Design a binder for this molecule. Sequence first.
Ligand SMILES: *[C@@H]1O[C@H](CO)[C@@H](O)[C@H](O)[C@H]1NC(C)=O
Ligand SMILES: *[C@@H]1O[C@H](CO)[C@@H](O)[C@H](O)[C@H]1NC(C)=O
Ligand SMILES: *[C@@H]1O[C@H](CO)[C@@H](O)[C@H](O)[C@H]1NC(C)=O
Ligand SMILES: *[C@@H]1O[C@H](CO)[C@@H](O)[C@H](O)[C@H]1NC(C)=O
Ligand SMILES: *[C@@H]1O[C@H](CO)[C@@H](O)[C@H](O)[C@H]1NC(C)=O
Length: 413
Amino acid sequence: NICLQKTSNQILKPKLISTLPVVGQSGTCITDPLLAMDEGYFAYSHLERIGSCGVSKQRIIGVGEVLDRGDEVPSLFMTNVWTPPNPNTVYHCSAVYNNEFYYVLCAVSTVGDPILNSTYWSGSLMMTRLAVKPKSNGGGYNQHQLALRSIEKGRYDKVMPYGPSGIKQGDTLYFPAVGFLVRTEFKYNDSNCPITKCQYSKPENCRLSMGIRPNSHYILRSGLLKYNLSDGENPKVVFIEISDQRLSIGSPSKIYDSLGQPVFYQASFSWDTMIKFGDVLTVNPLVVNWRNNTVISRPGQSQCPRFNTCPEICWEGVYNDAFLIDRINWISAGVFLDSNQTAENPVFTVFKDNEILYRAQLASEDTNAQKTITNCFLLKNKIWCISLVEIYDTGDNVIRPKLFAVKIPEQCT
Ligand SMILES: *[C@@H]1O[C@H](CO)[C@@H](O)[C@H](O)[C@H]1NC(C)=O
Ligand SMILES: *[C@@H]1O[C@H](CO)[C@@H](O)[C@H](O)[C@H]1NC(C)=O
Ligand SMILES: *[C@@H]1O[C@H](CO)[C@@H](O)[C@H](O)[C@H]1NC(C)=O
Ligand SMILES: *[C@@H]1O[C@H](CO)[C@@H](O)[C@H](O)[C@H]1NC(C)=O
Ligand SMILES: *[C@@H]1O[C@H](CO)[C@@H](O)[C@H](O)[C@H]1NC(C)=O
């Protein structure tokens, strides 16, 4: 039982918790965060850059346990850390937990960020497996690279992990992903671009905004990468595209279990800026029963600001996910930047489709903030959420992820 009523009472008490100590050291910038959680365990990643935010010094990928720290508040206890040999080659990591291991799928690139340099990326992927409870002298039990024998990608030129975390269904893992499709092969009817109440929107705007520029070589299509652990000695990776219902440019996404059923979140990196999430009807093919949410959006720039609904040509926005905490009433929780066109003012928010119930400001109105990743769970039968929030210090000119733990209150006063 949680508070189901709208209230201005400050019933949310966010607690500042803390994975690694380097996150705090002066002289290093911490970027490209990942946080994933399942079954009492977590996976975490960041890129460390000496000085500017840059020149990569170290990629860390670690796993551990989520535990009560001593005073009934959960925190993260790191258990097993891996450092890739060249931090300049590893991009877009994504984590799924299964049967005592976390599996982490990343892109390997000798040509930079594959999203920004798509035409030259080889499409190379790597899969690393990390024991959540390692063994002293555990060799290939503690950390192990898995051989990817084959990547099934259909009509797509390349496919890639794209989002912090996914789900397992038995022996099969599903990572959030994106497919690179040659723009000339994209099948789209401009009549489907919804411009009826949008006098300035051209019919072609949906189609042109399916890539990061209107004249891009590729369009981006979100979906899943399926990895079945029982599928022979070296399982294949299979791309599953998201359906064309409420289609938005392929963007960082998340699939997660909540209350026994999966939910899918897709970041709004274009003109469709109201929150894109909902229960998954089928995983393969991927169909999402998108919420008709009228209260949660995200900051952008001039053409696609917060609350924008009209088709425009734009590639802008921020990843601020939401986690379902009550299916019977469809109530969710996340951290959203309360601003129209600047990445500012992170607020922990509990909300329904057409109603914000209650909230708590995490910093100040002028606090610059960016990516937010929220996961909720039970601790002694009380609903807790942990949110990673990138806080940008404009004075210091440095981004650092902060971790907050918030108990969802039972009462409204
Ligand atoms: C982008 O791709 C080209 C392809 O050869 C490469 O030369 C260049 O290094 C890449 N740019 C960055 C910033 O990595
Ligand atoms: C294109 O889409 C519209 C959707 O209303 C449909 O009426 C039309 O028959 C479609 N066919 C085309 C563009 O070939
Ligand atoms: C995974 O692989 C096993 C063995 O081939 C098969 O029995 C099972 O149906 C597969 N599951 C999925 C979801 O593909
Ligand atoms: C959202 O709205 C559509 C109509 O555009 C409706 O068909 C669908 O059922 C609604 N989704 C919900 C309630 O999850
Ligand atoms: C932010 O955007 C909304 C919707 O267009 C508008 O109502 C509101 O006035 C804007 N806020 C500010 C502070 O300009």
